Every structure is written in structure tokens, then in C-alpha cells.
């Protein structure tokens, strides 16, 4: 029983990190996309003024 419980905990200890790894990148990609879109919009105004 004790070693079975130990293995059960070990399984979730991996599942949780495997789950979190995807969501972190999901947030980062959106942040970078927003920043890149702002940077793309700055140059349009620069060229319009020039």
C-alpha cells in the first residue's frame, strides 16, 4: 500500500508540470504577438509623417 501510494504521488508530480509547461508558452506567445503588432503599427505612423 505505501509504495503504491508513493507511485501514485510520483505520477501526478509529473502530470502537473507537463500541464503547466504548455500554458506558460501559450501566455508568452500572445504577449509577444501583441508587442509585435504594436511595433508594426509604430512604423506606419512614422512613414505617414515622413
Amino acid at each position: 500500500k505505501d509504495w503504491q501510494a508513493w507511485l501514485g504521488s510520483v505520477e501526478h508530480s509529473r502530470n502537473t508540470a507537463n500541464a503547466s509547461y504548455q500554458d506558460l508558452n501559450l501566455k508568452r506567445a500572445a504577449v509577444l504577438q501583441e508587442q509585435s503588432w504594436g511595433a508594426r503599427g509604430n512604423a506606419a505612423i512614422a512613414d505617414f509623417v515622413t
Binding site: 509585435s36 511595433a39 509604430n42 512604423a43 512614422a46 512613414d47 515622413t50
Partner: protein, 50 residues
């Protein structure tokens, strides 16, 4: 990359003007700069005409 190139060309225009470079040296620079971006765009997507 597109936003950086857009500002780079405009910023280089005045730098070349201040040095008294002839138009040919500006045209060759423009073509060389455009070629690099066009080649780089070949990997960052299929460039399929949509």
C-alpha cells in the same frame, strides 16, 4: 522584421544624403536590402500568393 526594415530604409536615406553619396550607391543598397528580406521571407512561411 517587417517593421524593422521599414524604419531602417527611411533612417538610412538621410544618412546617405548627409554624406553626398550618388544615387547609384543608394539604389544598390536598396536592392541589396530588399533581397535579404525577400530571401528570409521564403522560410518564414510559404509566401503562397494569398
Amino acid at each position: 522584421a517587417l517593421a524593422s526594415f521599414q524604419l531602417g530604409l527611411q533612417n538610412t536615406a538621410q544618412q546617405y544624403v548627409n554624406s553626398g553619396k550618388t544615387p547609384e550607391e543608394f539604389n544598390v543598397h536598396v536592392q541589396q536590402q530588399t533581397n535579404q528580406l525577400l530571401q528570409e521571407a521564403g522560410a518564414q512561411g510559404l509566401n503562397l500568393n494569398d
